[PDB]
Point group: D2
Chain length 218, copies 4
């Protein structure tokens, strides 16, 4: 643990639009980056109460808090103190598309995340605008190195009220601000849960567990 300590905090500054509805979110997080354990408390500071499912914003709120084994190079941790950015495409099965960008920096024991969110083409009577989602299923991100960048692909799914799933494909590109040692073909398994919230989701608490691994069957 050189630049990154065993216990870290972070601040999230997020702004964006969903179907043209502008919002701003602030967050205070903490966790153990080498254990892949992480918690964050969010406040909708502008544009609340949000007329869409919180769930679409939950995964935009922290890659340095991923447990990497010693034999897999940790792309994101290596990028610091210079830091990194990530770019995300979200393709929902009902036609909705989101583009998300992050800048991640470090100041002592604290990370700072600046996030821009742009989501549109959510059907007015769909699960997002009608708030019929009930959290993300645990996921597994396929990761590989290309052009000095780390590229992640994930088949995500939201649980629906009354049963069934609402599918979303993630493509996330991680861009270190300096050359780092590139990892081999691997996966990061994740569990993201909303552990607390108020009645209109203007305050939300989230927990995440992220562990990197080599292929299970090899």
């Amino acid at each position: 643990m050189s630049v990154i300590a065993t216990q870290m905090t972070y601040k999230v500054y997020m702004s964006g639009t969903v179907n043209g509805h502008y919002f701003e979110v602030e967050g205070d997080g903490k966790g153990k980056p080498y254990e892949g354990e992480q918690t964050v408390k969010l406040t909708v500071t502008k544009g609340g109460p949000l007329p869409f499912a919180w769930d679409i914003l939950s995964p935009q709120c922290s890659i340095p808090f991923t447990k990497y084994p010693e034999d897999i190079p940790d792309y994101v941790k290596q990028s610091f103190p210079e830091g990194f950015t990530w770019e995300r495409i979200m393709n929902f099965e009902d036609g909705a598309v989101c583009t998300v960008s992050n800048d991640s920096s470090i100041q002592g024991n604290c990370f700072t995340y600046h996030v821009k969110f742009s989501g549109l083409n959510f059907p007015p009577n769909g699960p997002v605008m009608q708030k019929k989602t009930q959290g993300w299923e645990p996921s597994s991100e396929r990761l590989f190195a290309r052009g000095g960048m780390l590229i992640g692909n994930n088949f995500m799914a939201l649980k629906l009220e009354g049963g069934g799933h609402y599918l979303c494909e993630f493509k996330t590109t991680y861009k270190a601000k300096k050359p780092v040692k590139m990892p081999g073909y691997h996966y990061v398994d994740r569990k993201l849960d909303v552990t607390n919230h108020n009645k209109d989701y203007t305050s939300v608490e989230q927990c995440e567990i992220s562990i990197a691994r080599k292929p299970v069957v090899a």
Copy 2:
């Protein structure tokens, strides 16, 4: 000439991000909405000079200026004084994705466009980040009515330095802020040209002709 005069002006206020790079643009436009003729002058007011091709921003700068025949209901012109919004997904062939949203309002002789642009996953050595584009080919947008909205689909192509094309698919959803009479299955043909610009594209002048038509062979 209902609420829209034979000769109109407009202001464009655009902001957003391309591969994390923040920018703001202001535009001054004028044209003849019933003739489908249009011109606009853009200034990059923040984040200039832009490290990407201006061409990706040019079609974000005016649907009320489309020549519609009398026998094809004009969705966008009908929307006023209330106005409308549009939501656009741009899918480039090398993986880049943009999501664009607009709010279009009217005050007397002047339209106001508020535009939010989010673009990412442009390859660093690609035509956009290397500024190798030389304008859009004339285009043909396929339009049809669904759920009180007008949906447009367009196979766009950027001309490349040294020859060849760089392809982009446009999907634009137009949403009137009141119910209007819906058109049948039709097309809008466009020609968008940069008619003047300075060396780093921090000042740009654009021309556009837009004409609606029924299928050519029917």
Copy 3:
């Protein structure tokens, strides 16, 4: 005219599967290749009556019959006597995907088309498996040259029983068996209609008009 006469006939031999259902189709066509006019009679010779909409097969039944203006090089007509192949991807909006391959040859006054059709992921309760489709809308194919091949893109739409449309994107790649003169950026406008059929569509008659043109607004 070189090897292609002003009045020509053709034979279609098509086989394939839709959701695993095997079929064979034989066709006798005739038309005026320089006028872009043609008609064809189809017989389902194996696997009939088909448990799916005929419409998905109708555009697989003749590119040499496209009216090209003198100033636009006719990629397909130039390919003969050697001939050409085409490869098509059809992406339906409800998730269905088709891949289609053709080989086109010439023998005197007759063209022979050998077609392989592969379609799957048509929802059992969707418009295709429930035969709720009512013909294709007139279309406009965007065509350009790349790598000695002609690439076509089309926003197709099927009319639905009870109103509304069922969308499909076409991507067709035309591959001449010899180097030919490559055309510029252009369009082909088409009208495809089922003009006759029996009660279970085991016999179908089709009419197609196809005319190439340069961009309307230029």
Copy 4:
């Protein structure tokens, strides 16, 4: 199981086209379906030697041989003796698309798979047509139940000569011929290796390990 023995054999009958090139393959396999272990020997019986990478055909040659834990319902094994079908879409990153349909039947101690393969838009100078691929990376299929069907999504990757990866997205739909008990959200991890072959790949031997699991981090 009373229908599926702890030691099984199978036969594969595959035919299809890649970029218009017709081929036929016959295979003889054996394995332990409750252990998720299997092997198969393939012969190119028609159209050989193949002018494309064998790797695109390797995953088309056996779902009943997946190791399922007792607490996760085995969709495919339950479908027998009636059997099941599968439909697969393959989307390669360079624009190539394949559609594959299978019918799986049982006859005492032997499965029979009938497979139709349709692959096209492989670039002539690409890794597949230039035979520059070096096997699939071990994979992880995301599986969920919808409409009595099992839907699998997989981020696959072919290893490249000289290094790097060539990406392919799999979507596979498994359709039982009778209603069965539906599993929850789960994963199947796989390793597929070519273990033997002749000089022109007209004979190929393959090994596959397949193990189902609940989410690693949950």
